[PDB]
Each structure stands twice: as structure tokens, then as C-alpha cells.
Design a protein around this nucleic acid. Structure first.
Lengths: 49, 86
RNA sequence: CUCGA
DNA sequence: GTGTCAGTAGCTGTCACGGATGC
DNA sequence: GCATCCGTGAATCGAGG
């Protein structure tokens, strides 16, 4: 669906390609450990904030 | 044997990684000074290591005990020793 | 902080 | 002596330049 | 071997609150 919305730009395709991790529960924890480092990452503890 | 004297540490380093970085923020909001918070955190967790009757019941909230320990120490610093100089 | 050459 | 959730404010509205720092 | 990012610098004196 992301490729569906931003497909008209090569820059967004290249972003999704050069991406590191894929998955709804993966990038979530990737954000959690950069925003509030040093804490155990729960799926719901990140889904909440 | 020696594995037990090592188990002590491996038990403390396991509560650190889950409660220290969170306790810090509490004393932070209450003191507005990350330095004193850094101090209070270590004081608290040292007492914790000194009071094993709290972590032994793993199934009970330990963080909840920690917060009160800290909250008390901060006001102990807001004692007469603070009123005059701060 | 506000201001003068 | 302490024990159920118990979790910053603030903030990027400067810039040119050189060289160690780092992928 | 080279781009990033760190650290350095950025007029003078003066008044009052």
C-alpha cells in the first residue's frame, strides 16, 4: 500500500528499498529504541506512546 | 560454589536493565536536575541490593517499591539542608 | 532586560 | 520506613570554515 | 580514501532596574 500511494516518485521507492527492517511490529520497536533508549521494548508499550 | 557469588551480580544487572532507566525519569521530573537524579538512582538501587526481601518475590511489582524509595530521598534533600542555600 | 555614541 | 498504574522540558529560526572523526 | 560533523570564532565603552 505504501508503494501504492507514493509510487509516482522514484525517491520514495528508493527509500522503501534501502530500508533496513520490514514488518509492522519491527519498525515499531526500531522507533521505540531510538525514542526512549535503555528500556525493554514491548509491542504494546510502544503502540501506546 | 562460585556460581552463586556470580548469581548475585547476574540478578542485579537484570533489574538494572529494566528499572534504572525508568526510575531516573521519575526523580528527573521531581528534581529538574538530571545530575541529582543520577545520584538518587544509584543510592536507591544500592539500598535495593541491600534489601533482598523485595526482589525475591519476583511475581510482585518491584518498580513500585523503588519509586517510593526515591520519592522519599528527594524530599530528604529538600530538608533544612536545602532551604537556606539553594 | 531596556537604552546612549 | 519505604512497596497495585505510578516515567524531562525544551527545542533548530545563526553561519563560515578547517580538520579530525568516522563509514 | 573521502564525506560528515565537531569545534572555533564572531566591535568598544557606558546607564539604570
Amino acid at each position: 500500500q505504501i508503494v501504492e500511494r507514493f509510487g509516482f516518485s522514484e525517491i520514495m521507492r528508493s527509500t522503501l528499498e534501502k530500508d533496513n527492517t520490514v514488518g509492522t511490529d519491527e519498525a515499531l520497536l526500531d522507533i521505540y529504541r531510538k525514542l526512549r533508549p535503555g528500556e525493554p521494548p514491548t509491542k504494546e508499550s510502544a503502540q501506546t506512546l | 560454589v562460585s556460581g552463586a557469588a556470580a548469581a548475585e551480580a547476574a540478578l542485579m544487572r537484570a533489574l538494572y536493565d529494566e528499572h534504572a532507566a525508568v526510575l531516573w525519569r521519575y526523580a528527573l521530573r521531581l528534581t529538574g536536575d538530571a545530575a541529582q537524579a543520577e545520584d538518587v538512582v544509584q543510592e536507591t538501587l544500592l539500598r535495593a541490593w541491600q534489601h533482598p526481601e523485595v526482589i525475591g518475590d519476583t511475581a510482585r511489582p518491584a518498580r513500585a517499591w523503588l519509586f517510593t524509595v526515591a520519592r522519599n530521598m528527594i524530599i530528604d534533600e529538600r530538608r533544612s539542608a536545602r532551604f537556606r542555600n539553594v
